[PDB]
Amino acid sequence: PFESSSKSDESLGSIIIEGTLDKFQLHKYFFIRRLRLLKLEDQTLTAFVG
Numbered sequence: 001p002f003e004s005s006s007k008s009d010e011s012l013g014s015i016i017i018e019g020t021l022d023k024f025q026l027h028k029y030f031f032i033r034r035l036r037l038l039k040l041e042d043q044t045l046t047a048f049v050g
Helices: 006-017 028-038
Strands: none
Touching: 006 028
């Protein structure tokens, strides 16, 4: 649920973004992905940099 699913949370947000409902605010999935993936390994030295 941290970085093996860094592809999977992006793919799930992309599959939710295939639904075009409220496309300005349909990046709430992208906001949850940007919170989740960057908050996955927030304790790091360089691995969060990319």
